[PDB]
Amino acid sequence: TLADAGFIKQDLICAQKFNGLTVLPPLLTDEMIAQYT
Amino acid sequence: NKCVNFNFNGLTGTGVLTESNKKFLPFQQFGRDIADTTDAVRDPQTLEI
Amino acid sequence: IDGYFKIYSKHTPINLVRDLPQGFSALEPLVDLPIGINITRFQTLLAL
Amino acid sequence: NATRFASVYAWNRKRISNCVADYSVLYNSASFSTFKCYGVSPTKLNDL
Amino acid sequence: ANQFNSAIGKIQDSLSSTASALGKLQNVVNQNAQALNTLVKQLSSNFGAISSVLNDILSRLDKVEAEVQIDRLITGRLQSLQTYVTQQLIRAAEIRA
Numbered sequence A: 001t002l003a004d005a006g007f008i009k010q011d012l013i014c015a016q017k018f019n020g021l022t023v024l025p026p027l028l029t030d031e032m033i034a035q036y037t
Numbered sequence B: 001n002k003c004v005n006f007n008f009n010g011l012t013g014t015g016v017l018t019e020s021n022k023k024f025l026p027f028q029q030f031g032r033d034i035a036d037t038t039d040a041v042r043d044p045q046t047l048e049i
Numbered sequence C: 001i002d003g004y005f006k007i008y009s010k011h012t013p014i015n016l017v018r019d020l021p022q023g024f025s026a027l028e029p030l031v032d033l034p035i036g037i038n039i040t041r042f043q044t045l046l047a048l
Numbered sequence D: 001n002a003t004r005f006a007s008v009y010a011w012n013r014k015r016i017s018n019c020v021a022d023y024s025v026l027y028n029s030a031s032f033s034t035f036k037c038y039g040v041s042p043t044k045l046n047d048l
Numbered sequence E: 001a002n003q004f005n006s007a008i009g010k011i012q013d014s015l016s017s018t019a020s021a022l023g024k025l026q027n028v029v030n031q032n033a034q035a036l037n038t039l040v041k042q043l044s045s046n047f048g049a050i051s052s053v054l055n056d057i058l059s060r061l062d063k064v065e066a067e068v069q070i071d072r073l074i075t076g077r078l079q080s081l082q083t084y085v086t087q088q089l090i091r092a093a094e095i096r097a
């Protein structure tokens, strides 16, 4: 149960964002990984 | 909804302000985030949160 | 504490014939008064 | 500006509460020879 | 075929039921969450300054008197980042392997 992955912010992770801590999105999405798989 | 150099009672900073839905009890005036930072305030002239 | 005296309170219904209730609930602040005196003893008052 | 201050062993304490301060009166008054603060700077006293 | 099909079925019946399987992945995620939560929580320290809130210094003190307190917060916070980025690097060598 992931605590965020960068899926559109528009809680630990509100505090993180407000202190410049940002989770970045991975290059290959879980769909593209499922496709290579 | 505008970014502003806020202050309330001496709680200075810079931020965007918004109307809360949080039900404070009558004695309460600040709220705090998981960080130990403020995240909500009762306005000292008009008692909305 | 250090020049200040304060009282919190809670009220709840229960049905225990001779006991203090099993469960959990919290006391909200009601006043603060800067009395600033040594305090070492207390006594309750009740009416007839 | 009281007529008489107290003996330091018995240093008087007066509360100040439910009032608006104007620290510029004091911070502008030439009559003091010591006006030192120890958790704040005096220019900010009106701002807090 | 039937043994393979039965075995694939036992992986389903396993992974659906049990609460202990993905511990190897979950412990990596748990540390990433916790290290960010630790790096957040260090902002609440004094480092011997008069506050952990940056503005409660600046809105209380003048320029000269702030520089002591702010240098204390930089001395703390900056070590708080170098610690994390060390931990993250070392962790990264565990994951890269």
Ligand SMILES: *[C@@H]1O[C@H](CO)[C@@H](O)[C@H](O)[C@H]1NC(C)=O
Pocket (backbone or CB within 6 Å): C038, C040
């Ligand atoms: C208050 O009373 C206690 C008990 O007699 C005593 O030890 C203490 O020194 C007193 N405080 C002052 C300020 O005299």
